[PDB]
Design a binder for this molecule. Sequence first.
Ligand SMILES: NCc1cccc(-n2cccc2)c1
Ligand SMILES: [Ca+2]
Length: 223
Amino acid sequence: IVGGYTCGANTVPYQVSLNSGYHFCGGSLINSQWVVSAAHCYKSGIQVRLGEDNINVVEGNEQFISASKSIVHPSYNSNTLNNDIMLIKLKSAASLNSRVASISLPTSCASAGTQCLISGWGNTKSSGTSYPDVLKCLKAPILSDSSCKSAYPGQITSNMFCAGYLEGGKDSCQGDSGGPVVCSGKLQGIVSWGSGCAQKNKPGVYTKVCNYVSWIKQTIASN
Ligand SMILES: NCc1cccc(-n2cccc2)c1
Ligand SMILES: [Ca+2]
């Protein structure tokens, strides 16, 4: 997160860190056994880390649970990043509490102008490289489809939306991938892609979660 703020420990209780020897992506806990992330975060040997603030220090509220299965969306295209969504099942159910909690799926899509919270342990620099230990947060509005398409000609599908600031300075970044965009207490987006970070006229692009609720529910119901 570039141009954000320190969230505060366990203030984003649905935020997970995906770890394969090191943090590599964010995710969102959607029930005791399931995490939603980006398809471009797919790899084998994933441990889901819940209740994290400082990802380099065991602070006492963590739960570390290995993935038993990952399910990349059947229509994910890694070239265009269309359908950039994946489900991860935990080997055992997380113990839910005030600091480890699921986030609700949307019942409808959120409109341009809606204020959202984007979070993660990604790069905090727009030019350089600096990775934080503690969770960073950014309040950002959803941008109009037209402005999103104008920013990225030929690249925005119906499964994507832009959020952030066309002036730059405030954005998600490398390592925030797969993490949450939460608006009005619903998971509306997944950190997906962009062109660099916090650059003028290059806002963050996010997987449009409301398009996938049926797939998520049915997949969970049979797996
Ligand atoms: N600024 C949007 C964004 C989201 C997720 C990742 C990246 N990124 C990947 C490499 C460099 C930036 C950007
Ligand atoms: Ca920790």
